[PDB]
Amino acid sequence: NIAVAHTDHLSVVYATMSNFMLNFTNNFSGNHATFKPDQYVITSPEGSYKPIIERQGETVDGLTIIDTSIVWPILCQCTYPLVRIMEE
Amino acid sequence: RYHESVLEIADIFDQADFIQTSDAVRQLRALMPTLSTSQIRHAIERIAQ
Amino acid sequence: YGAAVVNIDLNRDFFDTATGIDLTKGIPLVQDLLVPIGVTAGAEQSAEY
């Protein structure tokens, strides 16, 4: 039932959003077996070492931890403009 | 060097009481807008109504 | 005498409004059966055919 909303609508929002200005990193090559993020540091002979990507664990921001359970409402309690009967 | 393209089952199978492949139905489907399952269900509900 | 033009239409008396059909345009047209999603209002009209 919801598959058209995903493929034939939300896909375009992803395709746009990937071209947004500040979405600068390459997040995923589509190959789970091989892909690793490019890793960079600001680094100085004087001894600075500031990795851009780093693992500090749960933060105040609330972005670090992922509840996967979110997939359920998305499948079983969301409406979409494509489903359904016409909505601009 | 290739062309990715859709291939309808009617363009593979042609059993008389299984897969309707009348050129009438063929062209009639050719007239149809792209369809989700909700669209089809809306059609059935309308005809029933 | 003076009949300017004689067409062969689908019979309205048989394909009544009770069928949902409207033949005034010279083609059958049924509102809200097959209908495209994801389009501007009034883009639904051709599907009525």
Short mmCIF file of N, CA and C in Angstrom, two decimals:
data_model
loop_
_atom_site.label_atom_id
_atom_site.label_comp_id
_atom_site.label_asym_id
_atom_site.label_seq_id
_atom_site.Cartn_x
_atom_site.Cartn_y
_atom_site.Cartn_z
N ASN A 1 0.81 -1.21 0.00
CA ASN A 1 0.00 0.00 0.00
C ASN A 1 0.85 1.27 0.00
N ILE A 2 1.85 1.36 0.88
CA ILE A 2 2.66 2.61 0.94
C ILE A 2 3.86 2.73 -0.02
N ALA A 3 4.12 1.65 -0.75
CA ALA A 3 5.35 1.54 -1.52
C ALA A 3 5.46 2.60 -2.61
N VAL A 4 4.34 2.97 -3.20
CA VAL A 4 4.37 4.05 -4.18
C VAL A 4 4.76 5.39 -3.55
N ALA A 5 4.34 5.62 -2.31
CA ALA A 5 4.66 6.87 -1.64
C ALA A 5 6.13 6.91 -1.46
N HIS A 6 6.71 5.75 -1.22
CA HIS A 6 8.15 5.77 -1.00
C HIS A 6 8.89 5.95 -2.31
N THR A 7 8.76 4.98 -3.21
CA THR A 7 9.52 5.01 -4.45
C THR A 7 9.21 6.23 -5.31
N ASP A 8 7.94 6.50 -5.54
CA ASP A 8 7.53 7.44 -6.58
C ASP A 8 7.29 8.88 -6.07
N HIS A 9 7.73 9.18 -4.85
CA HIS A 9 7.59 10.53 -4.28
C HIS A 9 8.76 10.90 -3.36
N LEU A 10 8.92 10.15 -2.28
CA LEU A 10 9.97 10.39 -1.29
C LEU A 10 11.37 10.28 -1.89
N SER A 11 11.48 9.48 -2.94
CA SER A 11 12.74 9.30 -3.61
C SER A 11 13.22 10.62 -4.13
N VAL A 12 12.29 11.42 -4.65
CA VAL A 12 12.71 12.70 -5.20
C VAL A 12 13.16 13.64 -4.11
N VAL A 13 12.55 13.57 -2.93
CA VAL A 13 12.99 14.41 -1.82
C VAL A 13 14.39 14.03 -1.41
N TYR A 14 14.72 12.74 -1.49
CA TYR A 14 16.10 12.35 -1.23
C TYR A 14 17.03 12.88 -2.30
N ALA A 15 16.63 12.71 -3.56
CA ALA A 15 17.47 13.15 -4.66
C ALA A 15 17.73 14.66 -4.64
N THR A 16 16.75 15.44 -4.21
CA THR A 16 16.97 16.87 -4.05
C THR A 16 17.90 17.10 -2.88
N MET A 17 17.58 16.48 -1.75
CA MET A 17 18.24 16.81 -0.51
C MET A 17 19.71 16.49 -0.60
N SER A 18 20.05 15.56 -1.48
CA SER A 18 21.44 15.16 -1.64
C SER A 18 22.23 16.24 -2.35
N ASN A 19 21.53 17.09 -3.09
CA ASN A 19 22.15 18.22 -3.77
C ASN A 19 22.17 19.50 -2.96
N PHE A 20 21.60 19.47 -1.76
CA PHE A 20 21.63 20.64 -0.89
C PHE A 20 23.06 21.01 -0.55
N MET A 21 23.26 22.30 -0.31
CA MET A 21 24.57 22.90 -0.09
C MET A 21 25.37 22.27 1.04
N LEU A 22 24.75 22.10 2.20
CA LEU A 22 25.50 21.66 3.37
C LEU A 22 25.57 20.16 3.58
N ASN A 23 24.93 19.40 2.69
CA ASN A 23 25.02 17.94 2.75
C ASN A 23 26.32 17.43 2.13
N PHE A 24 27.45 17.96 2.61
CA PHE A 24 28.75 17.82 1.93
C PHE A 24 29.47 16.46 1.91
N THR A 25 29.22 15.61 2.90
CA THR A 25 29.86 14.29 2.98
C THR A 25 29.27 13.24 2.03
N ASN A 26 30.09 12.24 1.68
CA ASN A 26 29.59 11.03 1.02
C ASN A 26 29.22 9.97 2.05
N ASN A 27 27.93 9.91 2.38
CA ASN A 27 27.45 9.02 3.44
C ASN A 27 27.45 7.49 3.21
N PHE A 28 27.32 7.03 1.96
CA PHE A 28 27.16 5.60 1.67
C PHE A 28 27.20 5.28 0.18
N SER A 29 27.99 4.29 -0.20
CA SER A 29 28.16 3.92 -1.61
C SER A 29 27.11 2.92 -2.11
N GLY A 30 26.27 2.44 -1.21
CA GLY A 30 25.28 1.44 -1.57
C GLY A 30 25.79 0.02 -1.47
N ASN A 31 27.05 -0.13 -1.09
CA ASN A 31 27.62 -1.44 -0.87
C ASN A 31 27.98 -1.67 0.59
N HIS A 32 27.13 -2.39 1.33
CA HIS A 32 27.39 -2.59 2.76
C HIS A 32 28.69 -3.34 3.01
N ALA A 33 29.08 -4.20 2.06
CA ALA A 33 30.26 -5.04 2.24
C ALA A 33 31.59 -4.31 2.19
N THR A 34 31.63 -3.14 1.56
CA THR A 34 32.92 -2.52 1.28
C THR A 34 33.06 -1.08 1.73
N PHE A 35 31.95 -0.36 1.82
CA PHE A 35 32.01 1.08 2.06
C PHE A 35 32.54 1.46 3.44
N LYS A 36 33.47 2.42 3.47
CA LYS A 36 33.89 3.06 4.72
C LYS A 36 33.93 4.56 4.47
N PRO A 37 33.52 5.35 5.47
CA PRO A 37 33.53 6.81 5.33
C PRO A 37 34.95 7.33 5.14
N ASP A 38 35.12 8.36 4.32
CA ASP A 38 36.43 8.99 4.19
C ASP A 38 36.68 9.69 5.51
N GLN A 39 37.89 9.57 6.03
CA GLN A 39 38.17 10.08 7.37
C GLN A 39 39.23 11.15 7.34
N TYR A 40 38.92 12.27 7.98
CA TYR A 40 39.81 13.41 7.95
C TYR A 40 40.05 13.97 9.34
N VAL A 41 41.20 14.60 9.49
CA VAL A 41 41.52 15.32 10.71
C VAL A 41 42.11 16.66 10.33
N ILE A 42 41.82 17.66 11.15
CA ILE A 42 42.60 18.87 11.16
C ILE A 42 43.81 18.46 11.99
N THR A 43 45.01 18.69 11.46
CA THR A 43 46.21 18.21 12.13
C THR A 43 47.43 19.09 11.90
N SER A 44 48.21 19.22 12.96
CA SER A 44 49.29 20.18 13.01
C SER A 44 50.56 19.48 13.47
N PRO A 45 51.71 19.89 12.93
CA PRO A 45 53.02 19.41 13.40
C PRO A 45 53.20 19.74 14.88
N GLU A 46 52.63 20.87 15.28
CA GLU A 46 52.66 21.31 16.67
C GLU A 46 51.88 20.37 17.61
N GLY A 47 51.04 19.51 17.05
CA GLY A 47 50.46 18.43 17.83
C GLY A 47 48.94 18.33 17.91
N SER A 48 48.24 19.26 17.27
CA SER A 48 46.79 19.18 17.21
C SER A 48 46.32 17.96 16.42
N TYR A 49 45.23 17.35 16.87
CA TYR A 49 44.64 16.24 16.14
C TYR A 49 43.15 16.26 16.39
N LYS A 50 42.40 16.84 15.46
CA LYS A 50 40.96 16.97 15.61
C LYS A 50 40.31 16.19 14.49
N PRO A 51 39.93 14.93 14.78
CA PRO A 51 39.20 14.14 13.78
C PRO A 51 37.86 14.78 13.46
N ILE A 52 37.43 14.72 12.20
CA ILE A 52 36.12 15.27 11.87
C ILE A 52 35.04 14.29 12.31
N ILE A 53 35.21 13.02 11.96
CA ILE A 53 34.31 11.98 12.45
C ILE A 53 34.97 11.28 13.62
N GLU A 54 34.24 11.15 14.71
CA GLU A 54 34.78 10.56 15.92
C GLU A 54 33.66 9.91 16.71
N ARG A 55 34.02 9.01 17.61
CA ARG A 55 33.01 8.30 18.36
C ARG A 55 33.05 8.74 19.81
N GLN A 56 32.14 9.63 20.18
CA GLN A 56 32.09 10.09 21.56
C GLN A 56 30.90 9.55 22.35
N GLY A 57 30.06 8.77 21.69
CA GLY A 57 28.89 8.21 22.34
C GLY A 57 27.75 9.21 22.45
N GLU A 58 26.74 8.87 23.24
CA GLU A 58 25.50 9.64 23.28
C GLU A 58 25.80 11.08 23.64
N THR A 59 25.18 12.01 22.92
CA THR A 59 25.41 13.44 23.14
C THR A 59 24.13 14.14 23.55
N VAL A 60 24.26 15.40 23.94
CA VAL A 60 23.12 16.20 24.34
C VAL A 60 22.20 16.47 23.15
N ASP A 61 22.77 16.47 21.94
CA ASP A 61 22.01 16.80 20.74
C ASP A 61 20.85 15.83 20.48
N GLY A 62 21.03 14.57 20.86
CA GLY A 62 20.03 13.55 20.61
C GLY A 62 20.02 13.00 19.19
N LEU A 63 21.12 13.15 18.47
CA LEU A 63 21.20 12.60 17.12
C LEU A 63 21.93 11.26 17.04
N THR A 64 22.81 11.01 18.00
CA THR A 64 23.71 9.85 17.96
C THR A 64 23.05 8.47 18.04
N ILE A 65 22.01 8.34 18.85
CA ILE A 65 21.40 7.03 19.04
C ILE A 65 20.22 6.86 18.10
N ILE A 66 20.11 5.68 17.49
CA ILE A 66 19.06 5.42 16.52
C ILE A 66 18.03 4.42 17.04
N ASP A 67 16.79 4.85 17.23
CA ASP A 67 15.71 3.88 17.46
C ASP A 67 15.24 3.45 16.08
N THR A 68 15.40 2.17 15.79
CA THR A 68 14.99 1.63 14.51
C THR A 68 13.48 1.40 14.48
N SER A 69 12.87 1.46 15.65
CA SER A 69 11.45 1.17 15.83
C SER A 69 10.62 2.14 15.01
N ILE A 70 11.27 3.21 14.58
CA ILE A 70 10.65 4.26 13.81
C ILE A 70 10.06 3.69 12.52
N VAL A 71 10.59 2.55 12.08
CA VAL A 71 10.11 1.97 10.83
C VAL A 71 8.65 1.57 10.95
N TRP A 72 8.23 1.19 12.14
CA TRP A 72 6.85 0.78 12.34
C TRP A 72 5.80 1.85 12.07
N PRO A 73 5.92 3.03 12.71
CA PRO A 73 4.93 4.07 12.39
C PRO A 73 4.94 4.41 10.92
N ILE A 74 6.12 4.38 10.32
CA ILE A 74 6.29 4.71 8.91
C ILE A 74 5.54 3.73 8.02
N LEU A 75 5.50 2.47 8.43
CA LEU A 75 4.77 1.45 7.69
C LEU A 75 3.30 1.49 8.07
N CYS A 76 3.04 1.58 9.37
CA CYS A 76 1.72 1.28 9.88
C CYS A 76 0.93 2.42 10.51
N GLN A 77 1.48 3.63 10.53
CA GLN A 77 0.66 4.78 10.93
C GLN A 77 1.09 6.12 10.36
N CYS A 78 1.28 6.15 9.05
CA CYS A 78 1.53 7.39 8.34
C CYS A 78 0.70 7.44 7.08
N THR A 79 0.12 8.60 6.81
CA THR A 79 -0.50 8.86 5.53
C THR A 79 0.52 9.46 4.59
N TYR A 80 0.23 9.41 3.31
CA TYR A 80 1.05 10.08 2.32
C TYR A 80 0.15 10.77 1.31
N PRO A 81 0.67 11.80 0.64
CA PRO A 81 -0.01 12.42 -0.50
C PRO A 81 -0.31 11.45 -1.65
N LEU A 82 0.53 10.44 -1.87
CA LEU A 82 0.20 9.44 -2.88
C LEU A 82 -0.78 8.36 -2.38
N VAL A 83 -0.97 8.27 -1.07
CA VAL A 83 -1.77 7.20 -0.48
C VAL A 83 -2.59 7.72 0.69
N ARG A 84 -3.74 8.33 0.42
CA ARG A 84 -4.24 8.52 -0.93
C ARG A 84 -4.12 10.00 -1.30
N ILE A 85 -9.05 10.75 -3.34
CA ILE A 85 -7.80 10.01 -3.53
C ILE A 85 -6.65 10.91 -4.00
N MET A 86 -6.97 12.08 -4.54
CA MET A 86 -5.94 13.01 -4.99
C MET A 86 -5.66 14.17 -4.02
N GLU A 87 -4.37 14.43 -3.81
CA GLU A 87 -3.90 15.48 -2.92
C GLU A 87 -2.76 16.15 -3.66
N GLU A 88 -2.76 17.48 -3.72
CA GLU A 88 -1.73 18.18 -4.48
C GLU A 88 -0.34 17.91 -3.90
N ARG B 1 26.66 -0.92 -22.89
CA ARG B 1 25.74 -0.73 -24.01
C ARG B 1 24.50 -1.61 -23.90
N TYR B 2 23.44 -1.06 -23.32
CA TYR B 2 22.19 -1.79 -23.14
C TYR B 2 21.04 -0.84 -22.91
N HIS B 3 19.82 -1.34 -23.08
CA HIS B 3 18.65 -0.53 -22.73
C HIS B 3 17.79 -1.19 -21.66
N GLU B 4 17.81 -0.62 -20.46
CA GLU B 4 16.90 -1.06 -19.41
C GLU B 4 15.48 -0.68 -19.83
N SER B 5 14.53 -1.61 -19.68
CA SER B 5 13.14 -1.35 -20.07
C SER B 5 12.17 -2.34 -19.46
N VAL B 6 10.93 -1.90 -19.25
CA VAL B 6 9.90 -2.76 -18.69
C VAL B 6 9.41 -3.81 -19.69
N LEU B 7 9.11 -5.00 -19.19
CA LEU B 7 8.57 -6.08 -20.00
C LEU B 7 7.32 -6.63 -19.33
N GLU B 8 6.15 -6.34 -19.91
CA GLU B 8 4.89 -6.82 -19.35
C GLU B 8 4.78 -8.33 -19.45
N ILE B 9 4.13 -8.92 -18.46
CA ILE B 9 3.95 -10.36 -18.39
C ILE B 9 3.13 -10.82 -19.59
N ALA B 10 2.25 -9.95 -20.06
CA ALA B 10 1.43 -10.23 -21.24
C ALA B 10 2.33 -10.36 -22.45
N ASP B 11 3.50 -9.75 -22.38
CA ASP B 11 4.45 -9.79 -23.47
C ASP B 11 5.38 -11.00 -23.33
N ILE B 12 5.13 -11.82 -22.31
CA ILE B 12 5.84 -13.09 -22.11
C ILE B 12 4.87 -14.26 -22.27
N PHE B 13 3.98 -14.40 -21.29
CA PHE B 13 2.91 -15.41 -21.28
C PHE B 13 1.75 -15.03 -22.19
N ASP B 14 1.00 -16.03 -22.67
CA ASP B 14 -0.23 -15.75 -23.41
C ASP B 14 -1.30 -16.84 -23.25
N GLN B 15 -1.62 -17.19 -22.01
CA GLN B 15 -2.65 -18.20 -21.74
C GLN B 15 -4.05 -17.59 -21.68
N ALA B 16 -5.00 -18.25 -22.33
CA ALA B 16 -6.29 -17.63 -22.59
C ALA B 16 -7.13 -17.31 -21.36
N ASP B 17 -7.04 -18.15 -20.33
CA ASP B 17 -7.87 -17.93 -19.14
C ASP B 17 -7.02 -17.52 -17.95
N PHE B 18 -5.77 -17.17 -18.25
CA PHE B 18 -4.80 -16.80 -17.24
C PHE B 18 -4.42 -15.33 -17.38
N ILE B 19 -3.95 -14.96 -18.57
CA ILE B 19 -3.41 -13.63 -18.82
C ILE B 19 -4.10 -13.05 -20.04
N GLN B 20 -4.99 -12.09 -19.80
CA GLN B 20 -5.70 -11.43 -20.88
C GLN B 20 -4.71 -10.66 -21.74
N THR B 21 -4.65 -11.00 -23.02
CA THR B 21 -3.66 -10.42 -23.92
C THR B 21 -4.30 -9.94 -25.21
N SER B 22 -5.60 -9.65 -25.16
CA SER B 22 -6.28 -9.09 -26.31
C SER B 22 -5.65 -7.73 -26.63
N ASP B 23 -5.46 -7.44 -27.91
CA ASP B 23 -4.83 -6.17 -28.29
C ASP B 23 -5.75 -5.04 -27.88
N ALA B 24 -7.02 -5.37 -27.72
CA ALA B 24 -8.01 -4.43 -27.22
C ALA B 24 -7.62 -4.03 -25.82
N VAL B 25 -7.46 -5.04 -24.98
CA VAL B 25 -7.06 -4.81 -23.60
C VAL B 25 -5.66 -4.22 -23.55
N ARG B 26 -4.82 -4.61 -24.50
CA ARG B 26 -3.46 -4.12 -24.55
C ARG B 26 -3.47 -2.61 -24.70
N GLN B 27 -4.15 -2.12 -25.74
CA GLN B 27 -4.19 -0.69 -26.00
C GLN B 27 -4.96 0.07 -24.93
N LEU B 28 -5.97 -0.58 -24.37
CA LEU B 28 -6.73 0.01 -23.27
C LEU B 28 -5.84 0.24 -22.04
N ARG B 29 -5.00 -0.73 -21.70
CA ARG B 29 -4.00 -0.56 -20.65
C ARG B 29 -2.96 0.49 -21.03
N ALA B 30 -2.65 0.57 -22.32
CA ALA B 30 -1.67 1.55 -22.79
C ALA B 30 -2.19 2.95 -22.51
N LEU B 31 -3.51 3.11 -22.54
CA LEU B 31 -4.14 4.38 -22.17
C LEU B 31 -4.08 4.72 -20.68
N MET B 32 -3.94 3.72 -19.83
CA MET B 32 -3.96 3.94 -18.38
C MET B 32 -2.75 4.71 -17.85
N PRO B 33 -2.99 5.58 -16.85
CA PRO B 33 -1.96 6.25 -16.08
C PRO B 33 -1.25 5.22 -15.21
N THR B 34 -0.03 5.51 -14.77
CA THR B 34 0.70 4.60 -13.89
C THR B 34 -0.17 4.29 -12.67
N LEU B 35 -0.15 3.04 -12.21
CA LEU B 35 -1.07 2.60 -11.16
C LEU B 35 -0.38 2.02 -9.94
N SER B 36 -0.78 2.52 -8.77
CA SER B 36 -0.43 1.91 -7.50
C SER B 36 -1.53 0.93 -7.15
N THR B 37 -1.34 0.15 -6.09
CA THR B 37 -2.40 -0.76 -5.65
C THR B 37 -3.62 0.00 -5.11
N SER B 38 -3.38 1.14 -4.48
CA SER B 38 -4.47 1.97 -3.97
C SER B 38 -5.32 2.51 -5.11
N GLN B 39 -4.71 2.70 -6.28
CA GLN B 39 -5.45 3.22 -7.42
C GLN B 39 -6.38 2.17 -7.93
N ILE B 40 -5.85 0.96 -8.04
CA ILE B 40 -6.63 -0.17 -8.50
C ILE B 40 -7.79 -0.42 -7.54
N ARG B 41 -7.52 -0.31 -6.25
CA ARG B 41 -8.56 -0.55 -5.26
C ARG B 41 -9.64 0.52 -5.38
N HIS B 42 -9.21 1.74 -5.65
CA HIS B 42 -10.16 2.82 -5.84
C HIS B 42 -11.05 2.56 -7.06
N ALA B 43 -10.48 1.92 -8.08
CA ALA B 43 -11.23 1.59 -9.29
C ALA B 43 -12.29 0.56 -8.99
N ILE B 44 -11.88 -0.48 -8.28
CA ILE B 44 -12.80 -1.55 -7.96
C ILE B 44 -13.94 -1.02 -7.11
N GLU B 45 -13.60 -0.19 -6.13
CA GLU B 45 -14.60 0.37 -5.24
C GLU B 45 -15.56 1.25 -6.00
N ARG B 46 -15.05 1.93 -7.02
CA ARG B 46 -15.90 2.82 -7.78
C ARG B 46 -16.87 2.01 -8.61
N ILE B 47 -16.36 0.97 -9.27
CA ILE B 47 -17.20 0.15 -10.13
C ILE B 47 -18.28 -0.49 -9.28
N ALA B 48 -17.89 -0.91 -8.08
CA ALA B 48 -18.82 -1.55 -7.17
C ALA B 48 -19.88 -0.57 -6.75
N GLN B 49 -19.48 0.69 -6.57
CA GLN B 49 -20.40 1.74 -6.16
C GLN B 49 -21.41 2.03 -7.27
N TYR C 1 -34.83 16.26 -44.24
CA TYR C 1 -34.12 17.21 -45.07
C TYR C 1 -33.50 18.27 -44.18
N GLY C 2 -32.27 18.65 -44.51
CA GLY C 2 -31.54 19.63 -43.73
C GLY C 2 -30.72 19.06 -42.58
N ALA C 3 -30.74 17.74 -42.42
CA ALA C 3 -29.85 17.09 -41.48
C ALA C 3 -28.44 17.38 -41.97
N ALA C 4 -27.67 18.10 -41.16
CA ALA C 4 -26.39 18.60 -41.60
C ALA C 4 -25.35 17.52 -41.47
N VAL C 5 -25.36 16.83 -40.33
CA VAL C 5 -24.42 15.74 -40.14
C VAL C 5 -25.00 14.60 -39.30
N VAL C 6 -24.67 13.37 -39.67
CA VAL C 6 -25.16 12.20 -38.95
C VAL C 6 -24.01 11.33 -38.48
N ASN C 7 -23.86 11.28 -37.16
CA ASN C 7 -22.82 10.53 -36.47
C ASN C 7 -23.35 9.21 -35.94
N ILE C 8 -22.43 8.31 -35.61
CA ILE C 8 -22.78 7.09 -34.89
C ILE C 8 -22.16 7.12 -33.50
N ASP C 9 -22.98 7.48 -32.52
CA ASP C 9 -22.55 7.58 -31.14
C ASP C 9 -22.86 6.31 -30.35
N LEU C 10 -22.19 6.12 -29.22
CA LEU C 10 -22.64 5.12 -28.25
C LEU C 10 -24.00 5.54 -27.75
N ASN C 11 -24.90 4.58 -27.59
CA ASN C 11 -26.27 4.90 -27.19
C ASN C 11 -26.38 5.34 -25.73
N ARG C 12 -26.77 6.59 -25.52
CA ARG C 12 -26.90 7.12 -24.16
C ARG C 12 -27.99 6.40 -23.39
N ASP C 13 -29.03 5.98 -24.09
CA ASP C 13 -30.16 5.31 -23.45
C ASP C 13 -29.71 4.00 -22.84
N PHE C 14 -28.72 3.36 -23.44
CA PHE C 14 -28.17 2.13 -22.87
C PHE C 14 -27.05 2.40 -21.87
N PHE C 15 -26.10 3.23 -22.26
CA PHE C 15 -25.05 3.66 -21.35
C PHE C 15 -25.52 4.88 -20.57
N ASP C 16 -26.47 4.63 -19.68
CA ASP C 16 -27.14 5.67 -18.91
C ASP C 16 -26.23 6.29 -17.86
N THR C 17 -26.70 7.37 -17.24
CA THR C 17 -25.98 7.99 -16.13
C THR C 17 -25.87 7.02 -14.97
N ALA C 18 -26.77 6.05 -14.93
CA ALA C 18 -26.72 4.97 -13.95
C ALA C 18 -25.49 4.09 -14.13
N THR C 19 -24.90 4.11 -15.33
CA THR C 19 -23.64 3.43 -15.60
C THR C 19 -22.45 4.26 -15.12
N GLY C 20 -22.70 5.53 -14.85
CA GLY C 20 -21.66 6.46 -14.46
C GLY C 20 -21.06 7.18 -15.67
N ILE C 21 -21.41 6.71 -16.86
CA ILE C 21 -20.90 7.26 -18.11
C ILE C 21 -21.55 8.60 -18.46
N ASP C 22 -20.78 9.47 -19.10
CA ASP C 22 -21.29 10.72 -19.65
C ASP C 22 -20.81 10.80 -21.09
N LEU C 23 -21.74 10.79 -22.04
CA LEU C 23 -21.37 10.69 -23.45
C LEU C 23 -21.51 11.99 -24.24
N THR C 24 -21.76 13.09 -23.55
CA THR C 24 -22.05 14.36 -24.23
C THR C 24 -20.88 14.85 -25.07
N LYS C 25 -19.68 14.42 -24.70
CA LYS C 25 -18.46 14.82 -25.40
C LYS C 25 -18.11 13.91 -26.60
N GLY C 26 -18.92 12.88 -26.83
CA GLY C 26 -18.64 11.94 -27.90
C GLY C 26 -17.72 10.79 -27.51
N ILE C 27 -17.30 10.76 -26.25
CA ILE C 27 -16.57 9.61 -25.72
C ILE C 27 -17.14 9.27 -24.37
N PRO C 28 -17.04 7.99 -23.96
CA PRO C 28 -17.41 7.66 -22.59
C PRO C 28 -16.45 8.34 -21.63
N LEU C 29 -16.94 8.77 -20.48
CA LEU C 29 -16.11 9.46 -19.51
C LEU C 29 -16.66 9.18 -18.13
N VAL C 30 -15.87 8.51 -17.29
CA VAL C 30 -16.33 8.18 -15.95
C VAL C 30 -15.44 8.83 -14.90
N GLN C 31 -16.04 9.70 -14.10
CA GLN C 31 -15.29 10.38 -13.05
C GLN C 31 -14.90 9.47 -11.89
N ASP C 32 -13.69 9.68 -11.38
CA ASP C 32 -13.20 9.02 -10.16
C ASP C 32 -13.16 7.49 -10.20
N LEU C 33 -12.71 6.92 -11.32
CA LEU C 33 -12.44 5.48 -11.39
C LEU C 33 -10.92 5.27 -11.42
N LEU C 34 -10.36 5.09 -12.61
CA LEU C 34 -8.92 5.23 -12.77
C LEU C 34 -8.64 6.71 -12.64
N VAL C 35 -7.53 7.04 -12.00
CA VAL C 35 -7.19 8.43 -11.76
C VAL C 35 -5.74 8.49 -11.30
N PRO C 36 -4.93 9.30 -11.99
CA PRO C 36 -3.51 9.50 -11.67
C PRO C 36 -3.32 10.11 -10.29
N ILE C 37 -2.26 9.72 -9.61
CA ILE C 37 -1.85 10.40 -8.40
C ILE C 37 -0.70 11.31 -8.78
N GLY C 38 -0.42 12.31 -7.95
CA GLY C 38 0.79 13.09 -8.10
C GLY C 38 0.73 14.14 -9.18
N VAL C 39 -0.47 14.59 -9.50
CA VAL C 39 -0.65 15.53 -10.61
C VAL C 39 -1.56 16.69 -10.23
N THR C 40 -1.44 17.79 -10.98
CA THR C 40 -2.23 18.99 -10.74
C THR C 40 -3.70 18.71 -10.99
N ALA C 41 -4.57 19.45 -10.32
CA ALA C 41 -6.00 19.26 -10.48
C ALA C 41 -6.40 19.54 -11.92
N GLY C 42 -7.29 18.71 -12.45
CA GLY C 42 -7.68 18.79 -13.85
C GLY C 42 -6.81 17.98 -14.78
N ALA C 43 -5.76 17.36 -14.24
CA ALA C 43 -4.96 16.39 -14.99
C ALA C 43 -5.61 15.00 -14.96
N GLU C 44 -6.61 14.85 -14.09
CA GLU C 44 -7.37 13.61 -13.98
C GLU C 44 -8.29 13.35 -15.18
N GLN C 45 -8.60 14.39 -15.94
CA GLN C 45 -9.67 14.35 -16.94
C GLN C 45 -9.52 13.34 -18.07
N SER C 46 -8.32 13.18 -18.61
CA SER C 46 -8.12 12.26 -19.73
C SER C 46 -8.34 10.81 -19.31
N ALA C 47 -8.04 10.51 -18.05
CA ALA C 47 -8.20 9.15 -17.53
C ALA C 47 -9.67 8.77 -17.47
N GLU C 48 -10.53 9.78 -17.44
CA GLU C 48 -11.96 9.55 -17.41
C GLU C 48 -12.38 8.80 -18.67
N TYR C 49 -11.64 9.00 -19.75
CA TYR C 49 -11.92 8.30 -21.01
C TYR C 49 -11.65 6.81 -20.90
#
